[PDB]
């Protein structure tokens, strides 16, 4: 799953911030994206982030 899982920023993440849903916070917080790591749990828009991960 890619809704309640934490970001995989690791030791690689340039100057391109994105969004991820923090199941403990209640919304999709802004975090950067990397070209060296890059995984599935990553959303560019908060709308598609909460809609694809959550829904309500």
d(CA 16, CA 55): 26
Write down all domains in the chain, each with its CATH number in brackets: 1-56 (4.10.410.10)
Beta bridge partners of 6: none
d(CA 46, CA 13): 19
d(CA 14, CA 24): 26
The experimental method behind these coordinates is NMR
Give the CA dihedral 44, 47, 49, 50, nearest 10 degrees: 160
Per-position DSSP letters for 5-38, written without gaps between them: SPP--TT---S-EEEEE-TTTSSEEEEE--SSS-
């Amino acid at each position: 799953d890619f809704c309640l899982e934490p970001p995989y920023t690791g030791p690689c993440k340039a100057r391109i911030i994105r969004y991820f849903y923090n199941a403990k916070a209640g919304l999709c917080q802004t975090f950067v994206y990397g070209g060296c790591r890059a995984k599935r749990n990553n959303f560019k828009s908060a709308e598609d982030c909460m809609r694809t991960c959550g829904g309500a």
